[PDB]
Symmetry: C6
Subunit: 147 residues, 6 copies
């Protein structure tokens, strides 16, 4: 309904989310239109003034990317771009992309696999920079990670 979809390009692995939202990768969960992304079912992030950024935290289900993301994590591989695309039901009753969150030069700092979409997986990124854009109303803003 109002899910996010994500893409990862790793310096070593290329597009990590390639063919990752497909019948093969997700099975009965598959919906067309986002075949080279991953279906984000979670999100948490926080910037505070004691600025200090906190790691970005997404949640997905087990998939084609998953074994790759671990490789990423355990390898210490810099992620050239992680880009989170936000979706909503528009005012005219159609699904639309209306917000973007984007990491530049991100690094995966931890992963947790757990069963509760019953097969789950949270992934955490730090990054050198993050950009928030509103896609319909045209507002945008970005910033450099601190601490």
């Amino acid at each position: 309904a109002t899910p996010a979809y994500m893409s990862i390009t790793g310096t070593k692995q290329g597009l990590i989310t390639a063919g990752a939202f497909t019948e093969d990768s997700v099975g009965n969960t598959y919906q067309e239109g986002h075949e080279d992304q991953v279906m984000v079912q979670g999100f948490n992030h926080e910037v505070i003034i004691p600025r200090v950024h906190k790691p970005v935290v997404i949640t997905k289900v087990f998939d084609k990317a998953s074994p790759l993301l671990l490789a990423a994590l355990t390898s210490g591989e810099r992620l050239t771009k992680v880009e989170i695309q936000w979706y909503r039901t528009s005012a005219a009753g159609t699904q639309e992309h209306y917000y973007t969150t984007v990491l530049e030069d991100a690094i995966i700092v931890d992963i947790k696999d757990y069963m509760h979409f019953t097969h789950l997986e949270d992934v955490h990124f730090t990054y050198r920079k993050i950009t928030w854009t509103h896609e319909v109303s045209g507002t945008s803003g970005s910033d450099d990670w601190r601490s």
Copy 2:
């Protein structure tokens, strides 16, 4: 429900066009175009002289969001944060019946999370409280 307006020293009306179709999609409801909807609030004063805590508000992702996240990373002094609270009147009509206004508030924390929500904390220099229908009010400097 509540609607909030934020005017900052750099950006002006940060909440301009923030409750429109473009901003919040299907959730749009005419009448509060230059206000962000607030559906969560937290604030506290505790007692020897009183000390203040930050006002926390929860909103959804909208046009204001990136501006807000800017207001926080910049350190921009919010001239006015104004929260108008609505309720169903005794006669059966939505009415604006309360305001909580912060002067020179600052954003000291923002938490985004997932439907797609975002918490905002402000400290400030002065808070005002007014009951619009019964005509009572009070205010206090931050400490």
Copy 3:
């Protein structure tokens, strides 16, 4: 149903709950019969033997008193009388006042405004003395705050 209603008289402000449970003050929540009180939707208090009293803690919704109570709190104003009246459904099927809790020379020590009756507000009083009376059965007892 089984709500409490309260009255506050402040040394400086007089009857703080005056006209505070009315259409103007509470809106659609209004029920006649308690116009000069406030509708208490919460209560917590505790006396212990390590006697030591703990602050009295009520909960209400935003109202006509609310901006006043803050004035009280931030002013350090001594409350001459806070009096909490307890209501229940009687044995004959009618609502009745059957219990009273009363503070003498109370002081408001903290307030919390929060949205969950969706607009809420907890208020805490210390006091020099508190009296508990059962109104139908005639039992009563009082005591001086300690610590």
Copy 4:
């Protein structure tokens, strides 16, 4: 459900007329007029010799309440706190099937809260446990 009786050294039967119309309004149920209804219980013994914990009971606001709050602020030694537990018998009838009796119990904490409830803690000198239908029993000094 459970019903409790408390006789104190100063007041006598603190729970006299405590489960009547006057005391608990609509919730009244004949048969236990000189007992307060208990709908919450907590107690523990843990093990080198055993130590005791206070018996906690939860009741509603009633005629006993102010007397109880007195018993605590006075320090009055409760000669007897007696808790009789009821259940539905195998034949389909409410029956008294268990007792927990404290001797020289003391009230060491009371928590009132809101439908309108109140927790009571007792320490004591001796607790007895008896199963009324199966005819088993035990008891122990506080330590």
Copy 5:
């Protein structure tokens, strides 16, 4: 449905669970077939490698044994055998005993009485040894308590 039943034999008291699951002892809860046991409605236990055993923890309702178990606890009485019998719905639709847990030379280390089967009671045993047996498939294993 899938309850456990237990037996206790104490060095001093003999069979502590004798006549303890009966009309007299449990009232309307009574089901025939386990008259000399107790109806276990809880269970918790854990063995870890920092081996170190943790106390065995069962839950029952108030009953004929209960005043006895306290005697046991407060007396420091060694329990010659506590034996927990596990029940399930078989593949052919009939209730069966399929697992056993058994303590040798156990000691009751604490009891908690509490009201939530509304009248409840958790009991904790340490022990010199515990044996786990699967009754249909024939697997078994035992061990000595450590720490």
Copy 6:
């Protein structure tokens, strides 16, 4: 759902006949006779080089259980713990689509509790992850 196989150095296939009528009664489902059903999983890797956490799995009481509790009290090195994850395929059929395999895993904690459940923790020397339908994989030494 998931099914797990465990081969140990002393016992061989610890999960042999562990998902049969004899083992799990009414819950039996043909096709995975030498696998224990896993209906709960927890595992984590966190980041300067990576460190591993134990894989936790939850199962019911079954034929494997006492063997498992032995594997823990003995200290027996598990040659292979293999977890195959199933899902409903896009075409509407249960399919094995993922594996998590531990090499030389050790049981470092077991928690039994009540319908009748049991948690197992393994540390290990090497974990592998493979996506069976999309053909991706990774693995890592414990640290």
